[PDB]
Amino acid sequence: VLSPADKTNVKAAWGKVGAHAGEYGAEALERMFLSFPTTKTYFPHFDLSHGSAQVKGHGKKVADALTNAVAHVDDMPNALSALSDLHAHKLRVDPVNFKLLSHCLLVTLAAHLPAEFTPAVHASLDKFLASVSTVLTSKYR
Amino acid sequence: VLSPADKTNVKAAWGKVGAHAGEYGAEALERMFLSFPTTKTYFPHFDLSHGSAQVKGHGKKVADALTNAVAHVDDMPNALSALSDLHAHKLRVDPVNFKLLSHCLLVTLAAHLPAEFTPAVHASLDKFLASVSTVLTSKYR
Amino acid sequence: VHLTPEEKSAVTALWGKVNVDEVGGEALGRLLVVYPWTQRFFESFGDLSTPDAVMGNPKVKAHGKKVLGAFSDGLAHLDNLKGTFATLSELHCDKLHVDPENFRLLGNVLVCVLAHHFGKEFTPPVQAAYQKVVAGVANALAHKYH
Amino acid sequence: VHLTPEEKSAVTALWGKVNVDEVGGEALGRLLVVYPWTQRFFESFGDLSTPDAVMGNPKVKAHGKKVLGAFSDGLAHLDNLKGTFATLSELHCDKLHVDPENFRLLGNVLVCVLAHHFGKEFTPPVQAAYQKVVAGVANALAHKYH
Ligand code: HEM
Ligand code: HEM
Ligand code: HEM
Ligand code: HEM
Ligand SMILES: Cc1cc(C)cc(NC(=O)Cc2ccc(OC(C)(C)C(=O)O)cc2)c1
Ligand SMILES: Cc1cc(C)cc(NC(=O)Cc2ccc(OC(C)(C)C(=O)O)cc2)c1
């Protein structure tokens, strides 16, 4: 459950991301593909080379979804409804992979926000990513 | 989300468990300690030998909590409120261990309910155990 | 994997009573019913709309016996699972694009099927032996992923 | 664990810049803050109620230093992590009763701390090499559990 302090922390950190969201999304994906090779099995149709426009394009979509989730933090299930349908019935990504991407998103945020990534914000962001992950897999079965 | 069909399947299977709830709970724990040795790190204060009163007694407590969850399947967070507080604030069992106990409970039920353990009931019980596990770890942070 | 002589004999003894085709179809079908996202690789198998459709599907049954047959042959090479599954590992990674988590799920579903099939004979120690084997096979199949 | 020449160089070069004292305290502190249930092993450490209380706690900083210090010695024996951590592994199982899952969490938190501290220099390939190292150490430490 996200407490009001958690919401403030998430809104503050994401606000600093601002216009760089898409670039951070792509970097997070790159970190994931390199660190956890098995995640590449869901993108056999992509060029996963560093600099790939496909990865850059996808990172931007992932980041925009997160931006939408932050804006509707008090109403995530409905805001992400189409996305949970998509992952549950079409993409069918095994649930463990959401933990792998979440970690990589955290690492990306840490490497770019030295001043804002305090222990408290780290905890709030991890709680936030776990909630997003939960909503995205809520219709799996 | 447990669908209404799931709730019907869980009640029917658990009904059959009946009076054996306690001994099935003790069996599930023994199966967990043998298959997954790391779970024993949470019970260094127990005599874990086969048939110990401590394991049999704990097994009964676990099964009764599950029976309570079956009886209040429509409102689990409320029915398991005290157990959630306990695991979150005192026991502090890492979340992965709940999946391990859930699997061992599922194997125990399979071994004892030949007629009732159909593919659909297996799915419903697995979802139910995942739900109970989510409620029990919902106050961790 | 490191199995004690008693663990190896428990696995072997139990396996000799297994109808490989029956259990293979049963395990794969339950995998698809209990963890429906694994259905992603099988859209060409046809109707998988309901549990009865999955369990009665001839293509699901055929793939199950093929998968369990390779599993079965692997039990004769418990001391060299990585070498035995090396080519299958590469195939599953490079051509099939199967997330190795699926192997872990199949392994757990298989343990549940053996328990349902053998009842009381599937004792806690016997289950422990099978958990090690099923984890070993899943590790062997994911070894060549890159 | 097996690392390529580039990965081994990435790990080694970065570690030469790490102040074990400082980083160890950060990593352990953040572990206790982000994953509060890990505090169960440190009841005698004092005030652990708030993030600021955990981070400024002297016993947390001292322990973090000990932990990363032992972690450092493992980096010098990357080819034999199991033999290097055998004693500490038994210690963590038999005397301390620490669920090995905690080693995994610490490793991930350590990666976040290196990224926070080094920024741009902690590139995707460097992270990849460290994820392997941290997984290897966690595995080495869980090896003597029974
Ligand atoms: C924070 C978690 C995640 C978010 C918010 C997210 C969001 C999205 C969005 C917005 C799309 C694009 C849908 C569209 O075209 O409108 C998408 C597609 C997709 N996602 Fe997820 N996703 C997440 C995690 C994952 C994970 C962990 C994987 C797998 C390792 C994954 C694999 C895919 C795939 C394969 C596609 C299709 C890409 C394509 O072919 O264009 N997703 N996701
Ligand atoms: C279906 C999931 C579970 C349920 C329903 C459950 C239920 C319970 C109940 C009812 C108690 C007794 C509380 C009391 O005496 O007041 C308890 C205690 C405890 N549980 Fe959980 N539990 C679950 C999973 C776990 C897991 C996975 C572990 C760890 C591997 C665990 C470890 C403990 C420990 C150590 C105690 C204290 C036992 C004692 O010293 O008496 N629990 N649990
Ligand atoms: C004990 C585990 C497994 C073993 C031993 C195994 C073995 C095999 C074998 C022997 C084949 C035939 C390859 C060939 O014809 O050259 C195969 C094919 C394949 N496997 Fe696996 N497998 C396992 C698990 C899985 C799981 C869990 C999935 C996915 C949910 C999967 C999906 C596939 C697919 C899609 C093919 C292609 C089938 C076809 O083209 O007809 N496998 N596997
Ligand atoms: C992954 C890296 C780890 C390494 C290399 C490691 C290393 C050490 C070392 C060297 C000691 C000190 C033993 C002595 O001086 O007698 C020790 C003690 C300890 N470790 Fe670990 N450890 C690790 C992770 C963990 C984790 C994640 C936890 C739990 C959250 C943990 C909990 C403890 C506890 C409770 C002690 C005893 C402290 C005391 O005496 O009060 N360790 N560890
Ligand atoms: C023995 C053992 C060990 C581990 C780690 C996991 C399991 N199995 C499970 O976790 C099964 C399982 C259950 C639920 C899963 O995800 C969904 C989204 C359906 C959920 O969490 O409800 C995904 C998998 C068993
Ligand atoms: C890289 C990597 C790989 C894996 C498998 C897990 C992670 N980490 C996690 O998932 C962290 C995490 C997050 C939440 C956890 O449990 C609670 C109950 C708090 C939850 O699910 O919200 C438990 C652990 C990271």
mmCIF file of C-alpha atoms and ligand atoms in Angstrom, chain D residues 28 31-32 37-42 44-45 63 66-72 85 88 91-92 95-96 98-107 134 137-138 141, ligand 4:
data_model
loop_
_atom_site.group_PDB
_atom_site.id
_atom_site.type_symbol
_atom_site.label_atom_id
_atom_site.label_comp_id
_atom_site.label_asym_id
_atom_site.label_seq_id
_atom_site.Cartn_x
_atom_site.Cartn_y
_atom_site.Cartn_z
ATOM 1 C CA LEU D 28 23.416 -2.604 4.599
ATOM 2 C CA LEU D 31 18.728 -3.100 2.801
ATOM 3 C CA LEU D 32 17.182 -2.530 6.240
ATOM 4 C CA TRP D 37 11.797 -7.606 7.315
ATOM 5 C CA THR D 38 15.599 -8.074 7.100
ATOM 6 C CA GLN D 39 15.753 -6.133 10.423
ATOM 7 C CA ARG D 40 14.787 -9.403 12.154
ATOM 8 C CA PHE D 41 18.477 -10.371 12.355
ATOM 9 C CA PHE D 42 19.541 -7.091 13.981
ATOM 10 C CA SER D 44 20.466 -5.732 19.154
ATOM 11 C CA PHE D 45 21.566 -2.894 16.826
ATOM 12 C CA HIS D 63 28.503 -4.393 10.295
ATOM 13 C CA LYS D 66 32.546 -6.253 7.931
ATOM 14 C CA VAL D 67 30.162 -7.627 5.303
ATOM 15 C CA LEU D 68 31.633 -5.745 2.324
ATOM 16 C CA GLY D 69 35.120 -6.429 3.609
ATOM 17 C CA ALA D 70 34.460 -10.180 3.338
ATOM 18 C CA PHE D 71 32.761 -9.498 -0.024
ATOM 19 C CA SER D 72 36.051 -7.860 -1.203
ATOM 20 C CA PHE D 85 32.930 -18.693 1.508
ATOM 21 C CA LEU D 88 30.967 -18.235 6.461
ATOM 22 C CA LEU D 91 28.202 -19.958 10.023
ATOM 23 C CA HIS D 92 25.243 -18.222 8.389
ATOM 24 C CA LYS D 95 24.644 -20.338 13.979
ATOM 25 C CA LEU D 96 22.912 -17.325 12.459
ATOM 26 C CA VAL D 98 19.883 -16.419 7.859
ATOM 27 C CA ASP D 99 17.562 -17.340 4.979
ATOM 28 C CA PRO D 100 19.882 -17.214 1.879
ATOM 29 C CA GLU D 101 17.221 -15.152 0.108
ATOM 30 C CA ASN D 102 18.618 -12.190 2.106
ATOM 31 C CA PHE D 103 21.984 -12.540 0.269
ATOM 32 C CA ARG D 104 20.116 -11.962 -3.009
ATOM 33 C CA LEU D 105 18.415 -8.831 -1.734
ATOM 34 C CA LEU D 106 21.715 -7.404 -0.435
ATOM 35 C CA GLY D 107 23.352 -8.023 -3.780
ATOM 36 C CA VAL D 134 26.664 -10.763 -6.774
ATOM 37 C CA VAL D 137 28.544 -14.687 -4.015
ATOM 38 C CA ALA D 138 24.930 -15.249 -2.889
ATOM 39 C CA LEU D 141 27.096 -18.309 0.738
HETATM 40 C C1 HEM E 4 26.278 -11.184 0.920
HETATM 41 C C2 HEM E 4 27.374 -10.827 1.752
HETATM 42 C C3 HEM E 4 27.575 -11.265 3.086
HETATM 43 C C4 HEM E 4 28.806 -11.518 3.588
HETATM 44 C C5 HEM E 4 30.089 -11.578 2.756
HETATM 45 C C6 HEM E 4 28.677 -11.683 5.030
HETATM 46 C C7 HEM E 4 29.730 -11.662 5.923
HETATM 47 C C8 HEM E 4 29.668 -11.681 7.335
HETATM 48 C C9 HEM E 4 30.828 -11.699 8.241
HETATM 49 C C10 HEM E 4 32.299 -11.641 7.866
HETATM 50 C C11 HEM E 4 30.305 -11.793 9.481
HETATM 51 C C12 HEM E 4 31.047 -11.489 10.760
HETATM 52 C C13 HEM E 4 31.410 -12.763 11.486
HETATM 53 C C14 HEM E 4 32.352 -12.516 12.664
HETATM 54 O O1 HEM E 4 33.057 -11.467 12.680
HETATM 55 O O2 HEM E 4 32.385 -13.387 13.566
HETATM 56 C C15 HEM E 4 28.863 -11.923 9.365
HETATM 57 C C16 HEM E 4 27.971 -11.825 10.435
HETATM 58 C C17 HEM E 4 26.568 -11.653 10.349
HETATM 59 N N1 HEM E 4 25.839 -11.643 9.179
HETATM 60 FE FE1 HEM E 4 26.526 -11.912 7.298
HETATM 61 N N2 HEM E 4 27.356 -11.592 5.397
HETATM 62 C C18 HEM E 4 26.654 -11.311 4.240
HETATM 63 C C19 HEM E 4 25.252 -11.040 4.223
HETATM 64 C C20 HEM E 4 24.336 -11.075 5.275
HETATM 65 C C21 HEM E 4 22.938 -10.724 5.160
HETATM 66 C C22 HEM E 4 22.225 -10.294 3.885
HETATM 67 C C23 HEM E 4 22.422 -10.800 6.424
HETATM 68 C C24 HEM E 4 21.105 -10.583 6.878
HETATM 69 C C25 HEM E 4 20.227 -9.516 6.464
HETATM 70 C C26 HEM E 4 23.518 -11.201 7.295
HETATM 71 C C27 HEM E 4 23.436 -11.271 8.712
HETATM 72 C C28 HEM E 4 24.524 -11.477 9.584
HETATM 73 C C29 HEM E 4 24.404 -11.468 11.043
HETATM 74 C C30 HEM E 4 23.140 -11.449 11.891
HETATM 75 C C31 HEM E 4 25.660 -11.557 11.493
HETATM 76 C C32 HEM E 4 25.996 -11.546 12.957
HETATM 77 C C33 HEM E 4 26.277 -10.140 13.465
HETATM 78 C C34 HEM E 4 26.530 -10.112 14.976
HETATM 79 O O3 HEM E 4 27.489 -10.767 15.454
HETATM 80 O O4 HEM E 4 25.745 -9.446 15.684
HETATM 81 N N3 HEM E 4 24.683 -11.377 6.595
HETATM 82 N N4 HEM E 4 28.473 -11.833 8.052
#
